[PDB]
Amino acid sequence: TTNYWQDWTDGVGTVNASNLAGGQYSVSWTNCGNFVVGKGWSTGSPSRVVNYNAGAFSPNGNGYLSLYGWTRSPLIEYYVVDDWGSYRPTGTYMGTVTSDGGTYDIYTATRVNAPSIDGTQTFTQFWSVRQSKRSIGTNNTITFANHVNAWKSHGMNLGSSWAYQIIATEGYQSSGYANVTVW
């Protein structure tokens, strides 16, 4: 089960996040800047199988629902995006991976002098983005090893030092509400 609660916001707009029982959380936001809220594990694993049920995911504008985390050495931000609002995230196309009943496009991207778990840094993003939005309110599994190994085949090797790993609600200049249980 989960051991970690993440509640990060850049302070722009109103973001109200609740650390509920077990692996459950909720977040309501209005005209946010950027925020990342979710539950998961303080140390990510490339072989973790993550389950979640989004009782609600209703962005009004740009919001994502993703398996989300960081490695260091090198500094990499990674996503497995199952749902989004008005904006589907993309980068440089690398291929596809089919996992847990969905097909995901794979992308890389460079972020130059950008916010990160270690402050302003130049780093890389690894993305799997579902080709269509996954069903909301169902018990959904992300078999992360499939994504890790699909990424490896394209030279997207994750860092050797693992930071947190969560099912994250992320908003960008938007409003919305989400309620999610992770295990």
Ligand X SMILES: O[C@@H]1[C@@H](O)[C@H](O)OC[C@H]1O
Active site positions, annotated: 77, 170
Site for ligand X in 116-175 (CB under 6 A): 116-117
Q: Which of residues 34-63 bind ligand X (CB under 6 A)?
A: 36
Stretch in the footprint of ligand X (CB under 6 A) among 54-62, 115-123, 142-150, 171-179: 115-123
Q: Give the nearest distance from C-beta 98 to ligand X in angstroms.
A: 28
102 vs 104: CA distance, rounded Å:
6
Q: What residue type is 130 in one-letter code?
A: R
* Binding span for ligand X by CB under 6 A among 19-27, 112-120, 138-146, 153-161: 112-120
> Minimal CA–CA distance to 125: which of 137, 134, 117?
117
Minimum distance of ligand X from residue 20's CB (angstroms): 20
Q: Which of 87, 27, 26, 80 is nearest to 62 (CA)?
A: 87
**What is the total count of residues that contact ligand X (CB under 6 A)?**
5
Distance of alpha carbon 89 from alpha carbon 30, whole angstroms = 21
Q: Can residue 8 be called a binding residue for ligand X (CB under 6 A)? A: yes
Closest CA to 84 of 141, 168, 22: 168
Task: Scan residues 19-38 and list those touching ligand X (CB under 6 A).
Answer: 36
Pairing of strands 76-84, 121-130: parallel
Decide if residue 115 touches ligand X (CB under 6 A). yes
Residues that bind ligand X (CB under 6 A): 8, 36, 115-117
